[PDB]
Point group: C2
Chain length 176, copies 2
């Protein structure tokens, strides 16, 4: 009765769209975001998710676009609603700076596998949102200084965002 | 840097209280709940966390007291506020039916390692709460039918809950009428 629907992106090869089922009742809802048996097989040989992170952001925050050459991510929204965006940031890739966007909320609980070399970003449409992502990497976590950054509104990517004036960090402004 | 403070409980042998650091700014906060390196080492050799669950509950929900002899859990609240309760349900333990309570919210981001053979429960004080817990087990996941349930209001445990009138499932109500039969499989 714990189930996953696992579909590969039609737009970006190697991006996976994972949808869990849920048990809903008078108290709320219960669901499984991840099992090693269901999801780690999607990663390359020798790699498993080993790191769980939470981001709680206020309305009209954008975070991104962030990535590095080794870190795989599995991302969703576990409270509120986001626009989740994946960008192919591999400079050798024929689909370099193509993107895909997912509107994620409790009724659309897509979970996105973001490969290494892809950029990751989200926008908060709700009053606030809690972003959940898992990381898979060998050796050390790649912190912000060693990551690449693209501007949320880079004209090459041309993302359709629901904001014309987001709340950003200095990193994400420097990128613009 | 990503940091953890890890303390064993002073009350219940085997329970760990894990506290992350957070980066806070104008946008909100970022934090790490788990790394294999930091936390999987607290489990038995050969066992790792391999399952992630979310429970979103409305105000005044209780869930519990649920447990099984194989499954280790790592639990916190990632939105809202709960009263998280661990019960030692190991019948051999000197602290059998003793409990520890943690009020968990964004300013008190404790993450509780609940060992196999313990009972797990929580109550939602906020308008709603999102409960996050990881599971570590060999073999198949232990679903509701193969778990034990202790009554939320069992007077041998004597949990100080903030209400006498929580919202409960049929499973958690039925436990209040089967005290003494928690182990029946
Ligand atoms: N789809 C799905 N169903 C689940 C999951 N976890 C539990 N259930 C089902 O949800 C119901 C309640 O399970 P239980 O563990 O009693 O929930 P609790 O009372 O919140 O601990 C049972 O029917 C379970 O089979 C899950 O992760 N996914
Ligand atoms: N304590 C802690 N700091 C973090 C974590 N992740 C990122 N940071 C720090 O938070 C700040 C912003 O990081 P960045 O990756 O730009 O955050 P983003 O803008 O949300 O992607 C940087 O100083 C990071 O070192 C974490 O999990 N825990
Ligand atoms: K793998
Ligand atoms: K271990
Ligand atoms: Na694989
Ligand atoms: Na160990």
């Amino acid at each position: 009765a714990i189930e996953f629907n696992i579909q590969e992106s039609k737009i970006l090869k190697g991006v996976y769209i994972i949808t869990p089922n849920k048990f809903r009742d008078l108290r709320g809802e219960i669901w499984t975001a991840f099992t090693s048996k269901a999801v780690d097989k999607l990663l390359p040989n020798g790699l498993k998710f080993i790191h769980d992170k939470f981001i709680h952001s206020k309305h009209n925050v954008i975070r991104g676009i962030h990535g590095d050459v080794k870190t795989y991510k599995l991302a969703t929204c576990v409270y509120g609603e986001i626009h989740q965006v994946v960008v192919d940031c591999r400079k050798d890739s024929p689909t370099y700076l193509k993107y895909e966007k997912f509107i994620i909320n409790q009724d659309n609980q897509q979970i996105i596998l973001v490969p290494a070399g892809f950029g990751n970003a989200h926008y908060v449409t709700s009053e606030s949102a809690v972003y959940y992502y898992k990381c898979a990497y060998k050796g050390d976590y790649v912190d912000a200084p060693d990551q690449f950054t693209y501007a949320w509104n880079d004209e090459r990517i041309g993302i359709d965002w629901p904001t014309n004036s987001p709340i950003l960090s200095e990193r994400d402004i420097l990128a613009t």
